[PDB]
Ligand binder design. Sequence first.
Ligand SMILES: CCc1cc(NC(=O)Nc2ccc(-c3cnc(Nc4cc(N5C=CN(CC)C=C5)ncn4)s3)cc2)no1
Ligand SMILES: CCc1cc(NC(=O)Nc2ccc(-c3cnc(Nc4cc(N5C=CN(CC)C=C5)ncn4)s3)cc2)no1
Lengths: 301, 297
Amino acid sequence: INGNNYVYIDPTQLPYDHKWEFPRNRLSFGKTLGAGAFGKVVEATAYGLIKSDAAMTVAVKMLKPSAHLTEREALMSELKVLSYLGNHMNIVNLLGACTIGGPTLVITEYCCYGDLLNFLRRKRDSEDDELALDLEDLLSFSYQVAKGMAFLASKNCIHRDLAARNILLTHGRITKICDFGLARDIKNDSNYVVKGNARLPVKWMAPESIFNCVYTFESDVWSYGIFLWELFSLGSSPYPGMPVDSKFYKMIKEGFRMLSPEHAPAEMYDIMKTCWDADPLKRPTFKQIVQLIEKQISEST
Amino acid sequence: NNYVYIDPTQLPYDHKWEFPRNRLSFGKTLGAGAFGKVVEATAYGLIKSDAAMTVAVKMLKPSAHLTEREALMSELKVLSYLGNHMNIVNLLGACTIGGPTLVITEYCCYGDLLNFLRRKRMEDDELALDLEDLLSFSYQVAKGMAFLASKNCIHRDLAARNILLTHGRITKICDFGLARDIKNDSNYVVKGNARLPVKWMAPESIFNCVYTFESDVWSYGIFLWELFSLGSSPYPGMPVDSKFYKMIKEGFRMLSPEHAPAEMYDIMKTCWDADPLKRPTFKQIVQLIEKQISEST
Ligand SMILES: CCc1cc(NC(=O)Nc2ccc(-c3cnc(Nc4cc(N5C=CN(CC)C=C5)ncn4)s3)cc2)no1
Ligand SMILES: CCc1cc(NC(=O)Nc2ccc(-c3cnc(Nc4cc(N5C=CN(CC)C=C5)ncn4)s3)cc2)no1
């Protein structure tokens, strides 16, 4: 009933606080975790970031020399976003930043097990206690990601690229929503398709985003549905055996949708299908998804 | 450590645990020995009267004699005295009226850790996450045993076969006791008039079958060995014979499992000290493992 659903925070018109500033000379860079044309996240050690005595593993997002103005402003707005979100268990959390003394460096938590997609596909490489425990993990991942997106929505942020490749897994099997953004080489990732002037994750995108470039809280919900499908498919790409071409676009428009993964619980597939309503007003909110999944987890115990 | 116990015949039965026998719907047999079995059940109105809950029930077969019936009642009294802990199988209720004793506890949905460890098969991330699980199980069992000794309770048969795994990879210490077929389990060896888990027992316990808090710490060390070796049985290629007993007395100890962190093998080695007074308590082990997990982040 709220007006909060019709408004988003514009990261441009957001403000950076200097509590985060941290001396870049006390960073020891390590292995590169991800890289695209203009950007990279690198694993690093931060000395005295939390307790003045102890070093600490972190992740640092930075740009390559190849980057021009528009990426410099994008990294700034992302640093502002991260600063404005604060802390949630299921989002990558900002820890600090270096905007003086050189190029922008965005300092956040490091997730030690990488992205969920590669986790799922290693599992894919293969009644039963082991299958039950694996199903319990996937239920947990779907719950944690719904809670993290609910938090994002409550702060009026739209993710725009929700997918298993943008979910990180860390100690305790905690999942954190991230956005590799410029630190992903989308040119060589075939999940990103040329559409007009841009390279877009078409198979995760709601029809309003594909045909009208409309992004809203409810188009994030559509992407969440695709994520559940790849989650319960152990990371196979959506609409398998099907290129993104004119036939794909016509098929989404005419109302074809994916069948359930074999080992998706019926109620999780029910959520998926409501996420894929062509009418955004009929999709559940993330707050609603969280409510439904909690019931599923509680009944499972 | 203390050196005192209370025997179960001196503990009470709080009849607030009483549950109507007619509300159990018995399911698959979880484990059975000669005189007793544990079966999965549905209990209606056990925590709140609205709906039901999956539980586990330990009971005796018609074969049981008076001594097994006393033992089950004694087990019930111990679980009542113990109280609740996250890393113990907890009492939920009991049937003692109108029929034989039924002891109702939590059902652990993934079975015992030994079978879980043995069913295993690798990229670095998968290795790391498996190691994180093994450290967690180490910590959780040490916390559970820390709780047992704080209640002056001695387990006597701590082993991976007596650790259960359930939702969230929470481990619960249990004891199938009479619900294990110990004559057909080669990990229990004839010793005098009993079949005993001699490979898990401390040397000092073998003389007169005396169990202590420090011999539980010895068994925990053996447990760590089967944990980090993914469930292989201890002292490979060494049957329990005259030479086994001799070799332990002379000081022979198991080498480290290949995937044990050197700090966890150091714990094992202190657990196997020939002088029980030099072994760590479980409280100290909990503190040591807390540090290891904390640094791993
Ligand atoms: C609210 C949404 C949002 C996001 C955003 N920006 C935003 O997240 N940037 C951003 C910041 C930080 C990160 C990362 C943090 N930790 C990471 N760890 C790994 C580990 C890994 N391994 C692979 C393999 N192995 C052993 C073989 C170990 C590790 N591979 C790849 N990454 S990557 C990602 C993105 N702004 O808003
Ligand atoms: C404080 C120390 C102490 C303990 C004590 N007594 C004491 O523990 N009794 C006692 C009570 C309860 C239990 C059990 C509780 N849940 C259990 N679940 C399973 C599940 C399972 N599965 C196998 C396979 N599959 C695939 C279909 C699924 C499941 N297999 C075996 N068991 S067994 C054990 C013993 N007294 O003192």
